[PDB]
Amino acid sequence: WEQYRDRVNMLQQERIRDSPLLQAAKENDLRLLKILLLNQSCDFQQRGAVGETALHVAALYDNLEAATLLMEAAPELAKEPALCEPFVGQTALHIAVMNQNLNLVRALLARGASVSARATGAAFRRSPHNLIYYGEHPLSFAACVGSEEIVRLLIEHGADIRAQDSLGNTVLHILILQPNKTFACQMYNLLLSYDEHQSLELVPNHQGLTPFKLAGVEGNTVMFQHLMQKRKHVQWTCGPLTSTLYDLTEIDSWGEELSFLELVVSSKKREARQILEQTPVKELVSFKWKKYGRPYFCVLASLYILYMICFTTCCIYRPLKLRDDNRTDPRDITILQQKLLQEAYVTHQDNIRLVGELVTVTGAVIILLLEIPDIFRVGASRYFGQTILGGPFHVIIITYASLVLLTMVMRLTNMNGEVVPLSFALVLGWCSVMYFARGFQMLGPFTIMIQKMIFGDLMRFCWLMAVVILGFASAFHITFQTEDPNNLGEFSDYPTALFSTFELFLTIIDGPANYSVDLPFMYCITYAAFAIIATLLMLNLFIAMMGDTHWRVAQERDELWRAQVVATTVMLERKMPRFLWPRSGICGYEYGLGDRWFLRVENHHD
Amino acid sequence: WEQYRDRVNMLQQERIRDSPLLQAAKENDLRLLKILLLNQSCDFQQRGAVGETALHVAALYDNLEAATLLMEAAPELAKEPALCEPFVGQTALHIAVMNQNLNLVRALLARGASVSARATGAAFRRSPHNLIYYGEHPLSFAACVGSEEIVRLLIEHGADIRAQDSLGNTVLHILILQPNKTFACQMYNLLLSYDEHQSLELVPNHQGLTPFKLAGVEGNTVMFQHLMQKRKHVQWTCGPLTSTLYDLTEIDSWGEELSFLELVVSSKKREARQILEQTPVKELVSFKWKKYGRPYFCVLASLYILYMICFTTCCIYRPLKLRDDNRTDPRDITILQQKLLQEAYVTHQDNIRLVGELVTVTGAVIILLLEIPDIFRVGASRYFGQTILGGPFHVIIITYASLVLLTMVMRLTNMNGEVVPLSFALVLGWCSVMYFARGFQMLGPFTIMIQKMIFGDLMRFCWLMAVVILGFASAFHITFQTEDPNNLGEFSDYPTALFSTFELFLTIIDGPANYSVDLPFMYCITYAAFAIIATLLMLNLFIAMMGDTHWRVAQERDELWRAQVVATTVMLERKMPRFLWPRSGICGYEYGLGDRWFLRVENHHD
């Protein structure tokens, strides 16, 4: 894993220093190389621990002259890769081009090594174990290290540009994946300069992503504006303001089932939610949200609110009747029970309840057919994970629909205890209305601040809170086991002691003090300790830390809501029919440009 | 102490100005020195108040010509130290080298004073009274003042480097203790340049610290990185990333009973918790914590949680029986008493309680044998002081174990009132579960946030709060001494008035308002004053004060938890057996480097 690389690197260094040829290639001592290399006793074809040649060692430590002597000693020697597990296809050309040694690449290609060497090594993988992902080809290595002249020399000697390595990446896919994008613009332009006849910008991965879509997924906004310098047309400039015409061929993506915007808004990266703020995308999703996204989202919110008002008033009236058996036990105070299904629906008002039951079952099943293909369309961690797609809202919507269908099963089969899934369904369903709060600037950042504090501060407070409740509830229950439960009914046995200590943590119920009887002194001492620790400190320390993280996380949740309205926009027009959602953008067929469906913006630059 | 130095300095200045020779050496008047010292009536061997020579006075005020004039008049004055209490061995060479007077040191060593002068004076001590700790030798003075050429002159005239003063420090120990580390790197290299055959880097103090260990203790991260430049080996570089090989001979410290990391994490200094974030230490303690520290810490947390669930369960079920005597006193609610040991264990369920009581007794004694050698291993203020080592958690763990054994003594000897050590043991034991919250990023900084508010803001609020409770409880008790206790049972006598005013401070219990009777008006007036002052202002000012403290202290508790996980890691593998904890790092014996047990890192610098 991580110590296997350490072990194989130490074996590599040990096999370098044990061999005289490999250590002499490392040390760049030319005369001792001449002494051991003029004799025929030494073996030119000699492996290291990773299967490396001594030429790989000489290219590893920037030894130009040692590489020239082992090249003139054997001209076949450059055409040999390492053949062990970390470097399955690494050649001396790859090591020579990663170090940006021009004369070594010149002499090594003069000897005639393959430029199409395809290194299927574990170190050259897109993995968290590896520090870089520079490629599996020498041209990908040359572009990712940032050298123009070595790229031109590699194109001059073979090395076709359309070379797809593992995970489907070409060199244009993998220029975007690198950081430090200052020199990557000119490298992208240089590699598009030799692309002269399908184009190279449209080849997909094994994931299926376009380099445009890979720039959208990875959040590389510098490559995104570099791609939109070449996908825009400036219509006119009139003094301080200009009008220009962007192309929505690759952003809107009509014919493709996996659109660009869905791959942007459902990425695992911390960025790519700031690429929605860029000049082609911001105006498009603003027009798409204000023209159609906000009115259909508001009428969907109103329909869901009216449906769950109907479900709530369908919960308020229930088939409840008087208990047939009288109560023979004190402390038992139930007077009504759930009546049977044979006596449930006989009146007109029970028929008005029954049609509301049919409405809420129909609503639950159309929720399930809306959501379960969305569960199966993406990953399960991809659907329930991000708050951008409303993942916690998705799982409570799924839980609410399953609890309503469980209530349907319990009603028809006449099982008692319907109040427990009805109350769970009421809480989770009315908290599912909070999903529709993202469409408003007033309610959206507030709602995701609530969910992000639920994930961050609420759990970390509730662990230590449950620690304090467990300890002080154990003390409160063992202070009154010797005492009368009829004077203080709280802390009578351990579950109500735990619940009572939980309520006195939050200062909800009153402090237990029956002043007409003699309470224990140790209850006063440990209640003073509980009041200093829990009520005085822990609640106010919770307020202090959540304000302290509120002022830090406020900007992040503002831009998170700004990405969330885009995710809400592109969640629609996939589920809704296309006669509700016309194709956004100015159509180019009416003006003779060839059905590319452009979008015009006007900006004031002076 | 501090005014004794003022007194001896004023006596020194008075004895300078009273003597004509000392004042003439101070004033640098050469001619008046020639008339006074050409005559034989004056005394060359003449003391000040601190036993100083007039040559010491001439060296004190950078008087070169006067000092050389007393050299040519009397050459024996250079070989003479001050012999009084603040300067027991200070010579003219020490004063000459602290002022960086090169020609004065040249002339004074040309006359032949000792370079091995060893000043056992109170001013040259590592003490808070003294401003600097420059040494007790002239070469330590030359190193700490930062002059290369006087160091080379002192090596040129005697003055071996291996000279240990009081506290066992050599020169390389004492370069690290100085601030302003810009010039101390080249001074360190210059003093290692003449170290050519045990090495000078390995001589300890009287405390036993290595200079590497002294840099680890003092938090001198500049000297730490300078030392790790010279104990590392760069294995290779390949383009943007390089792999290098640090040595863990002095960091891991196998054979030594006082390890480097324990001396780092258990220091009194505010820094050296930032020296754990350096390049060889961060990867080592991260591998040590993720590979072994987190799983055994999690299973220790689970074992402690299950043990104290067992202890809580043995607390809930107790040998309790009905009272033999009936209640002849109202306000008394005691219905049960704890039964005798002869009748305590006769059922099956009492045997299940008894085996769990044996489990918690053996748990308490293995807590005591784990903790009491850790109390005796370090200082008692060292063990219970820092929150890095979990000192408050250590003292509440000690108190919990002693209370459980006290409960064992009270159970066997049948003393009443077991609810007092059982309730304190339950509260302190379940709050000792918070010690295991430091192993998680979600719970650790929150837990030490709680302890830092307990030490800082809770005590400073509770002093002023207990002042308000005392005053308003005195007012509330003297507003209702003339009134009926049966209508308001609170404020009946003074302890329940104090407790009731304590609860009304925290807004836990309701405001005392019996609306069916005529309450006094002055209770309403002083309750309005109490509600404005305590409930409205003081509680919310406590919220505001810990918010204002939290935004300043959040970064400090982040790095405090980052040091705390290292202290948790190195607390383990000393207590746990070595078959649970293998030796961390890449072993050098398998690769022929001489069992130095290195550690390899790979870093991306470009």
UniProtKB/Swiss-Prot annotation, chains A, B:
Stretches assigned to the Extracellular side: 317-353, 411-416
Tissue occurrence: Detected in kidney cortex, in distal convoluted tubules and cortical collecting ducts (at protein level). Detected in duodenum, jejunum, ileum, kidney and placenta.
Activity control note: Activated by WNK3.
Residues that span the membrane, as ranges: 296-316, 354-376, 388-410, 417-437, 461-481, 525-545
Keywords: ANK repeat, Calcium, Calcium channel, Calcium transport, Calmodulin-binding, Cell membrane, Glycoprotein, Ion channel, Ion transport, Membrane, Metal-binding, Phosphoprotein, Repeat, Transmembrane, Transmembrane helix, Transport
Record's catalysed reaction(s): Ca(2+)(in) = Ca(2+)(out)
Effect noted on mutating residue 503 to A: Minor effects on Ca(2+) permeation
Gene Ontology process terms (BP): calcium ion homeostasis; calcium ion import across plasma membrane; calcium ion transmembrane transport; calcium ion transport; protein homotetramerization; regulation of urine volume
Full protein name: Transient receptor potential cation channel subfamily V member 5
Species for this entry: Oryctolagus cuniculus (Rabbit)
Residues of the full protein shown: 29 to 638 of 730
